[PDB]
Amino acid sequence: EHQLDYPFADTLPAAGDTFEVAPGVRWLRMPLPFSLDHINLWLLRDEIDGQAGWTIVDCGISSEAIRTHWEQIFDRHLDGLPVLRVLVTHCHPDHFGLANWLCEGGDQGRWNVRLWMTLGEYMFGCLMAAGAAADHFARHGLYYSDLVPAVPPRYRRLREGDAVKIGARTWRVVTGYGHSPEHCALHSEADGVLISGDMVLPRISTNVSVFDLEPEANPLALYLESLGRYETMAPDTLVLPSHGKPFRGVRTRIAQLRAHHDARLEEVRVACAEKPMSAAGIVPIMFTFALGEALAHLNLLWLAGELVREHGDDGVIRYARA
Ligand SMILES: [Zn+2]
Ligand SMILES: [Zn+2]
């Protein structure tokens, strides 16, 4: 991380509190009970139809800790203004879980506002909250509703290239692929601010996986292509990532992510040059989730013509050179 610039140094907002990272832009940090221990949420000062308030970006999972901290932020750090709408970058549970609860005003029903989301994320989120994977993981070498217990039944659709006026800014929708169906990052070009969601994280790489639902997918190529959207943005762009700290150096970080994935891909090349490898066989070299990440690297090489697949007489799919 030492090649990155953290403009606020050791600053981390306390739970239940905000930190102003830019005029009208407040940073909240919520605890998560996983190895990924936090998510950053954004409170944006706003005014819609003459009414001043806040646009929320991302929600937290549905947990007692996060809910309690939202109630504290409602009580102490909204200047007595309402939330005007809830905007969600993508459907992963730490971003989307509390969307319905937020939309409907939290524990005390303080407002009733609309969810803003991309169609792919909202639809996929709906599909997943309505809840096989054994015949899929076996052929490669081997609950969402707890975190998202309700979903808003309506939404206002965000699309690539939309201009979303929030307070004094025009945030441009920048869609990203490979991590999730249709990931919404928000770009404010005039002043140089980027709400990056999970597409550009300063300290950790972005999850990229192949699942049973789309088993020939190429998420890593999609992701590596999506990264070009931030590479061309201003060098001094303030990045607001959902995990880690606000930072400058987006081009430097992306250079690191591209190098990292290149090293990962090369290890997979090396392994399949020795003998045909299954996704399960790639895991110990590369590092249930991990199989999906191994499948993403194998599928990229496969779809690029660098590997061929074969269904073995034991029903395992293996990847080797042509
Ligand atoms: Zn995510
Ligand atoms: Zn995330």
Automatic annotation (TrEMBL):
One of its GO terms (molecular function) is metal ion binding. Residues 38-243 form the Metallo-beta-lactamase domain. Zn(2+) 2 binds at residues 94-95, 198, 243. It holds the Pfam family Lactamase_B. Zn(2+) 1 binds at residues 90, 92, 179, 198. The keyword Signal does not apply. Keywords: Metal-binding, Zinc. SMART domains: Lactamase_B (SM00849). InterPro entries: B_lactamase-like_C, Metallo-B-lactamas, RibonucZ/Hydroxyglut_hydro, Sec-metab_biosynth-thioest, WH-like_DNA-bd_sf. This is Beta-lactamase domain protein.
